[PDB]
Design an enzyme around this catalytic site. Structure first.
Site, mmCIF file in Angstrom:
data_model
loop_
_atom_site.group_PDB
_atom_site.id
_atom_site.type_symbol
_atom_site.label_atom_id
_atom_site.label_comp_id
_atom_site.label_asym_id
_atom_site.label_seq_id
_atom_site.Cartn_x
_atom_site.Cartn_y
_atom_site.Cartn_z
ATOM 1 N N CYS A 140 10.346 -8.990 2.072
ATOM 2 C CA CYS A 140 10.916 -8.923 0.541
ATOM 3 C C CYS A 140 10.351 -10.245 -0.142
ATOM 4 O O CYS A 140 9.853 -11.063 0.636
ATOM 5 C CB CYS A 140 12.348 -9.273 0.567
ATOM 6 S SG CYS A 140 13.327 -7.768 1.540
ATOM 7 N N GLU A 174 6.286 -4.509 2.107
ATOM 8 C CA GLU A 174 6.997 -3.261 2.443
ATOM 9 C C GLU A 174 7.573 -2.726 1.124
ATOM 10 O O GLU A 174 7.591 -3.396 0.086
ATOM 11 C CB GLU A 174 8.168 -3.948 3.411
ATOM 12 C CG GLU A 174 8.938 -2.969 4.359
ATOM 13 C CD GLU A 174 10.120 -3.544 4.736
ATOM 14 O OE1 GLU A 174 10.092 -4.761 5.457
ATOM 15 O OE2 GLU A 174 11.098 -3.021 4.859
#
Ligand SMILES: O=C(NNS(=O)(=O)c1ccccc1F)c1ccccc1
Ligand SMILES: [Zn+2]
Length: 269
Positions: A140, A174
């Site tokens: 993140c 991601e």
């Protein structure tokens, strides 16, 4: 009912998403966060008491980057569990898709700060799995709203690829990315690739080795720049030195960057 406003430092910030702070922390008009240790508190009175007592003036962990007043700390989730959990709950107020807040030991956290005489002030961070099955070099990434679109997200993206380069590996964030995340990575990728095609017969595998950007992210970026042809099942770079300069001269790449100075990065894999 949910937390919908925080106070951190001298900022008041409206929440964007649900974050699972304990129920009774929600009930308050505001949640109050220590900007240095990220402890969250229910009341302006407990907050101001804490500010008078708390001894921290920067993140924990190792300062692995320092140039002038820009600093990055590397914080292992196993070594600094509470701080990392606090950071994740803060992050989730501004990330829709983050799902991990408490089981932080598998992660390392890279905290970006801006320093003045009072201390090191948190701007944002990215997490990274110590062992990524999928080769993700970011889990993140989050920049606090008052710092977004001001160069700090580009810095952290760049920083995540400088670690990947030191690892002799390619990496990709991601998925899913936020709307700003998508635009920011596409713009970072475009700049880095265009500058390498100016500065240098480079193949796509060549560029991937030089930048640690994956071949797929390189290809999708070149496609959006209309700089790749397709031949017998292979993507092939196809661009004029002049078309590269046309892209680099454009108004999109005109803000002066905070650059990552690899001389100031202290890190081994
Ligand atoms: O603040 C953000 N981006 N705008 S930026 O830093 O000026 C920037 C400018 C140029 C290229 C990439 C950038 F990132 C951001 C927030 C959350 C995740 C990723 C980025
Ligand atoms: Zn504190």
């Amino acid at each position: 009912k949910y937390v919908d406003k925080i106070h951190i430092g001298n900022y008041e910030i409206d929440a964007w998403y649900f974050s699972p702070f304990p129920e009774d922390y929600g009930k308050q008009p505001k949640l109050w966060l220590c900007e240095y240790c990220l402890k969250y508190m229910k009341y302006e009175k407990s907050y101001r008491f804490h500010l008078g007592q708390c001894q921290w003036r920067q993140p924990p962990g190792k300062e692995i980057y320092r140039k002038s007043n820009i600093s990055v700390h590397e914080v292992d989730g196993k070594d600094h569990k509470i701080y990392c959990q606090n950071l994740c709950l803060l992050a989730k107020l501004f990330l829709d898709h983050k799902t991990l807040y408490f089981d932080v030991e598998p992660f390392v956290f890279y905290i970006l700060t801006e320093v003045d005489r009072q201390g090191a002030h948190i701007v944002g961070y990215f997490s990274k799995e110590k062992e990524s099955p999928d080769g993700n070099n970011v889990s993140c990434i989050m920049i606090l709203p008052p710092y977004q679109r001001r160069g700090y997200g580009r810095f952290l993206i760049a920083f995540s690829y400088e670690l990947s380069k030191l690892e002799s590996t390619v990496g990709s964030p991601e998925k899913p990315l936020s709307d700003l995340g998508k635009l920011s990575y596409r713009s970072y990728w475009s700049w880095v690739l265009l500058e390498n095609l100016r500065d240098f017969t480079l193949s796509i595998k060549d560029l991937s080795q030089m930048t640690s950007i994956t071949q797929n992210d390189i290809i999708s970026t070149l496609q959006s720049l209309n700089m790749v042809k397709y031949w017998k099942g292979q993507h092939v770079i196809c661009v004029t030195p002049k078309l590269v300069e046309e892209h680099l001269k454009s108004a999109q790449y005109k803000k002066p960057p905070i650059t990552v100075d690899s001389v100031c990065l202290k890190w081994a894999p």
